[PDB]
Design a binder for this molecule. Structure first.
Ligand SMILES: [Ca+2]
Ligand SMILES: [Ca+2]
Length: 683
């Protein structure tokens, strides 16, 4: 199977995701609809169940609507059993779990969406049509709760395949956090306190850790192809790395988290998370900039290029960034007036780096500013809209042109309103020109490209007013006019390729596991895959995909390269993280660690998971507000099971790092359960 096959579920760079709000798409089976106050058959009371279900999605796969658009993946809300209570809402009358965000049993289905058999039907129907299926999973919380009023909602009660674990009131087991609600005043505050009134799960509780691992395996066993993890800024990094290892050790699938970033927001924790957690991220830097430039007129094409360059610098796995122009929370991109801006934002996203996702109804110009106005029932299945056809024409290019799926991005021409950029992967090229100005044309002179000499037709066929270009042997493009609102796409796909790696997944692995290397020019005869300079055992070999067993190298990060059977060597794909063993979440706690202003406590130790004594990569800054208070510090850390570790704490700020004196602390990590290790700072 090639890199582009539906069964390659660790690489989504060749795909286009269609994000469906299940309840609000198609009611394919009325018999599974809720009854009473939960359900609104009129589809107008925007926090009720409207009846959209998995059979409905199946219908639109079978009838060609989604495939006719070039959709190759769907992303659906959490499939798990949700609460049945109808909650008061002064604006919408009643408020329900239609959205899937309010889990009561992570091991069972939401019966309104369907049974496990319906879910199976969805997976199988999608696969029969070369569509991958991503599910939301929201292990941060169960549902709205009041500890003092257990009659409110379902008191956040959690079940384990029908068996009650417990609720938020009288939580004698400590399944939930009891630290009030977050005001988002710090990263720490947002992790250990409740989001709104949602009962915050305590993942450090060994029963809950084991439960959530068991629960995601239920869905992996149902044949899901990907996971979108909700609220990843609101759970410990260490717990989530541990959670990711459980998934990837069982059956690896592409996983991406939601870590919201606002306009112009800078957060090094977001970069770290994407680079270290073992999962990818929804690309808010991309999305917010696209909105600024194409929708809201608060930045220019210069800002768009700056985002392209900055994100590529910061993120180790730029091809895994999940891009989008709107979603279930943002104001819908189409806001009235000309539809050209949304068409342009779609074209940009579909031809840019990463993994594009399109929110249902974007192709029908649906409007709606704010949750839940942005979640109206799907309005139309008209296949003649300009937006539908932009997607139809551009989506398949991610499969047919490896420059689009995997290539670098280079600015070739720019002014405030015009961006001409080039995607390049070996001798494969895509050149895209966009003029956002809806009233002014631009004369394009001095343009150069890596496209071979020749004349190139617009892949869009003039749908967005594109036209042909002529390219000379020196790469110079004959002057041309970019008309108002024009988008044009020109491409060259080479008939041959030197070995080129476009993607490796998963990025967090260990000895004996299998990783997938995708690209071009590997040849059909088996060669060699190198982890640094150490060969791995070949599982399978094809021109666009090699599967290889991870060798027993010293745990840490490795740069992957490939050598063909003739001896040709590929580029390196960097920073594949080889763990020491299966992961466990351990809470590290240090008492009596006093610091000066601007100084924080960090953890360092003698395994890769603790940075192998590298103070510049020490774990932290540690926390000291919620679970324990300064000068006690704590942090939840993913560490190798059953391993006897040595560690110390350090204090750093910018002047001179202070280490604990004395001998190293030592601790043997549990074999399967979460653990806590508490020590006193050593002078
Ligand atoms: Ca239904
Ligand atoms: Ca939390």
């Amino acid at each position: 199977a090639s890199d582009t096959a539906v069964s390659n579920v660790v690489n989504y760079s060749t795909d286009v995701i269609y994000q469906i709000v299940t309840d609000r798409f198609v009611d394919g089976n009325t018999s599974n609809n809720p009854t009473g106050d939960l359900y609104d058959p009129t589809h107008t009371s925007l926090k009720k169940y409207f009846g959209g279900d998995w059979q409905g999605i199946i219908n639109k796969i079978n009838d060609g609507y989604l495939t006719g658009m070039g959709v190759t993946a769907i992303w659906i809300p959490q499939p798990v059993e949700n609460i049945y209570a109808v909650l008061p809402d002064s604006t919408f009358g009643g408020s329900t779990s239609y959205h899937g965000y309010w889990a009561r049993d992570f091991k069972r289905t939401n019966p309104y969406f369907g049974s496990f058999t319906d879910f199976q039907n969805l997976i199988n129907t999608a696969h029969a049509h070369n569509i991958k299926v991503i599910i939301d999973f929201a292990p941060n919380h169960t549902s709205p709760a009041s500890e003092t009023d257990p009659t409110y909602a379902e008191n956040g009660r959690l079940y384990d395949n029908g068996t009650l674990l417990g609720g938020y009131t009288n939580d004698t087991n400590g399944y939930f956090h009891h630290y009030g609600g977050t005001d988002f005043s710090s990263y720490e505050d947002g992790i250990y306190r409740n989001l709104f009134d949602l009962a915050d799960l305590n993942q450090q509780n060994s029963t809950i850790d084991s439960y959530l691992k068991s629960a995601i395996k239920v869905w992996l066993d149902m044949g899901i192809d990907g996971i979108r993890l909700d609220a990843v800024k609101h759970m410990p990094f260490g717990w989530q790395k541990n959670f990711m290892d459980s998934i990837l050790s069982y059956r690896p699938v592409f996983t991406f988290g939601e870590w919201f970033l606002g306009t112009n927001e800078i957060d090094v924790n977001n970069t770290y998370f994407a680079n270290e957690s073992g999962m990818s991220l929804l690309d808010f830097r991309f999305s917010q900039k696209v909105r600024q430039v194409f929708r809201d007129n608060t930045d220019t094409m210069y800002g768009l290029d700056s985002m392209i360059q900055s994100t590529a610098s910061d993120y180790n796995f730029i091809n895994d960034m999940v891009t989008f122009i709107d979603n279930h929370d943002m104001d819908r991109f189409y806001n009235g007036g000309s539809t050209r801006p949304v068409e342009q934002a779609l074209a940009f996203t579909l031809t840019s780096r990463g993994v594009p996702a399109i929110y249902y109804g974007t192709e029908q110009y649906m409007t709606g500013n704010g949750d839940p106005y942005n979640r109206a029932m799907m309005t139309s299945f008209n296949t003649s809209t300009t937006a539908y056809n932009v997607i139809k024409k551009l989506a398949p290019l991610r499969k047919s042109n490896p420059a689009i799926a995997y290539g670098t991005t280079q600015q070739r021409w720019i002014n405030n309103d015009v961006y001409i950029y080039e995607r390049k992967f070996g001798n494969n090229v895509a050149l895209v020109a966009i003029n956002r100005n809806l009233s002014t044309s631009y004369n394009i002179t001095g343009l150069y490209t890596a496209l071979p000499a020749g004349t190139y037709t617009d892949v869009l066929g003039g749908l967005l007013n594109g036209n042909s270009i002529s390219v000379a042997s020196d790469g110079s493009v004959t002057p041309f006019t970019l008309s108002a609102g024009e988008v044009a796409v020109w491409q060259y796909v080479s008939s041959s390729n030197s070995p080129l790696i476009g993607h490796v997944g998963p990025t967090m692995t260990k000895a004996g596991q299998t990783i997938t290397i995708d690209g071009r020019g590997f040849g059909t005869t088996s060669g060699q895959v190198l982890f640094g300079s150490t060969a791995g055992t070949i599982v399978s070999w094809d021109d666009t995909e090699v599967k290889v067993k991870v060798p027993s190298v010293t745990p840490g990060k490795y740069n992957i390269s490939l050598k063909t059977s003739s001896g040709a060597t590929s580029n390196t794909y960097n920073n594949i993280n080889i763990l020491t063993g299966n992961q466990i979440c351990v809470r590290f706690v240090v008492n009596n660690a006093s610091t000066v202003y601007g100084e924080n406590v960090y953890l360092t130790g003698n395994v890769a998971e603790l940075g192998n004594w590298d103070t510049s990569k020490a774990i932290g800054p540690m926390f000291n507000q919620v679970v324990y208070q300064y000068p006690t510090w704590y942090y939840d850390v993913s560490v190798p099971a059953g391993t006897t570790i040595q560690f110390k704490f350090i204090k750093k700020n910018g002047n001179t790092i202070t280490w604990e004196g004395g001998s190293n602390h030592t601790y043997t990590v549990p074999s399967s359960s979460t653990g806590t290790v508490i020590v006193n700072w050593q002078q």
